[PDB]
Every structure is written in structure tokens, then in C-alpha cells.
């Protein structure tokens, strides 16, 4: 019997994926996977100063706010890509089919 014991809750991992690294898009809205952390967002230059043992940062509501680049150690802020509600203004189909 071999038991492999680990925790996935420690952000600065140094072990485990045969993934092929690519470039960093930065400002354009993209999908990303940083050391197993996945998501969609806009990666921008951060002015935050992370401590040597901190890979991830979080906001007021304990969700991921910024990451440390695995190869360059640049700190990047993650802003979700713009979204919002869509409201349809209709004069009524018994008058006109134009819509705003």
C-alpha cells in the first residue's frame, strides 16, 4: 500500500502537472489556469506587494483577486470580464416591431 498525502489549499505549489506553458495575454479578456486555479478574466499589472510565501491574494469577500506569475513572479490583478443585464424596450407588437 502506498498513500499519497497532500493538501490542495496551499497556493505556492512546486509540484505536479505535465502542462505546456504559453505566453501571458495580459490586458485582453482571457481564460487562465495558474497552478490549477482556473477562471475567466482580465489580467493587469498589479501594484500590490506580495510576501515571499504568498502566491494568491483575495479581496474583501475571500475570492481570488490577484496572482503571482509562476515563472516571472509578476503580480497580476484579475478583474472579471465586463458583464451585465440586458433590458429590452419594446413599443408593443400591436404598434411596431422596432426594439431598443
Amino acid at each position: 500500500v502506498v498513500v499519497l498525502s497532500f493538501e490542495l489549499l496551499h497556493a505556492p505549489a512546486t509540484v505536479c502537472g505535465p502542462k505546456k506553458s504559453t505566453n501571458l495575454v495580459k490586458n485582453k479578456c482571457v481564460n487562465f489556469n495558474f497552478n490549477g486555479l482556473t477562471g475567466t478574466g482580465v489580467l493587469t499589472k498589479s501594484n500590490k506587494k506580495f510576501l515571499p510565501f504568498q502566491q494568491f491574494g483575495r479581496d474583501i469577500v475571500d475570492t481570488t483577486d490577484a496572482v503571482r506569475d509562476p515563472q516571472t513572479l509578476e503580480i497580476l490583478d484579475i478583474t472579471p470580464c465586463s458583464f451585465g443585464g440586458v433590458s429590452v424596450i419594446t413599443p408593443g407588437t400591436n404598434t411596431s416591431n422596432q426594439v431598443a
Partner: protein, 47 residues
């Protein structure tokens, strides 16, 4: 003489109350703040 054409008492009433939400278009803000600071900051679907 002042913008909004409110009475002296109305400006006092408006200055006394602190509005946490003050709804308007906020997407332009994005980052560069010390922290996002919100009350979802839109991101979690609450506006």
C-alpha cells in the same frame, strides 16, 4: 446659486446621509484601487 437647485436644508440633509450604493455605471472603475472594496462590486451578480 448652487448646482442641483436644492434648498439650504436639502443640501444639509443630503450631506448628513451617507449613501453606500449610489447606483450608476461602475464598470469603468475596474482595478488600481487598494482593494475592490464592496455590495458585490457587480462581479458576483448583485447590482
Amino acid at each position: 446659486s448652487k448646482p442641483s437647485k436644492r434648498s439650504p436644508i436639502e443640501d444639509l440633509l443630503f450631506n448628513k446621509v451617507t449613501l453606500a450604493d449610489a447606483g450608476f455605471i461602475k464598470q469603468y472603475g475596474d482595478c488600481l484601487g487598494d482593494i475592490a472594496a464592496r455590495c458585490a462590486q457587480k462581479f458576483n451578480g448583485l447590482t
